[PDB]
Amino acid sequence: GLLWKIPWRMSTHQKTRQRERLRNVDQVIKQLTLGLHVQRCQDKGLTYQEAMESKKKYKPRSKSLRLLNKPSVFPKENQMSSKDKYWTFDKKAVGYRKGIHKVPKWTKISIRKAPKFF
């Protein structure tokens, strides 16, 4: 019909970009957590520097942040597998897999955890 010339693989450059994006997302989360921790420290009664130093850093309480922190639910880039950085689970593909770059707004969308065996 109408030619949408989009390849089934990604170029190395694309892959690298994807990786970078993933890393950035992780970093954002990390930063958020750090901020929360330092706020907690300040509330308790410490300085900024002191808070930064502290061995026992506080985990976040809010559900979403906690979930993000868990690597079971939301892996970090170094943890993540090759097969999940550049492919998603498609319920109706051959091999039940599909290049992430096919997913509508893949540059914004985050999607790490494919199914366990698929």
Partner: protein, 82 residues
């Protein structure tokens, strides 16, 4: 403590809920920088749009004027009137 939150990706193409969230966050345009007090709610909000946003924790916030001043380039000259 304060978050320095930047909109690093355009809202164009992003679902309207997410757009709304971003608007609430006080982020008007791409590349726009906001300094938000750190409380859990704000953090939660940021989490939702994490893929659009670049964040970093800082000691103190900055008023827009201050930010502008910081931005300004060095005019490599000193005028003398005669």
């Amino acid at each position: 403590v304060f978050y320095k939150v930047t909109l690093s990706r355009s809202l164009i193409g992003v679902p309207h809920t997410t757009k709304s969230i971003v608007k609430s966050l006080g982020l008007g345009k791409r590349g726009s920088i906001v300094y938000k007090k750190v409380n859990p709610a704000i953090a939660g909000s940021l989490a939702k749009v994490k893929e659009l946003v670049k964040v970093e924790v800082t000691e103190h916030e900055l008023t827009p004027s201050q930010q502008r001043e910081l931005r300004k380039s060095n005019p490599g000259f000193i005028v003398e009137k005669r």
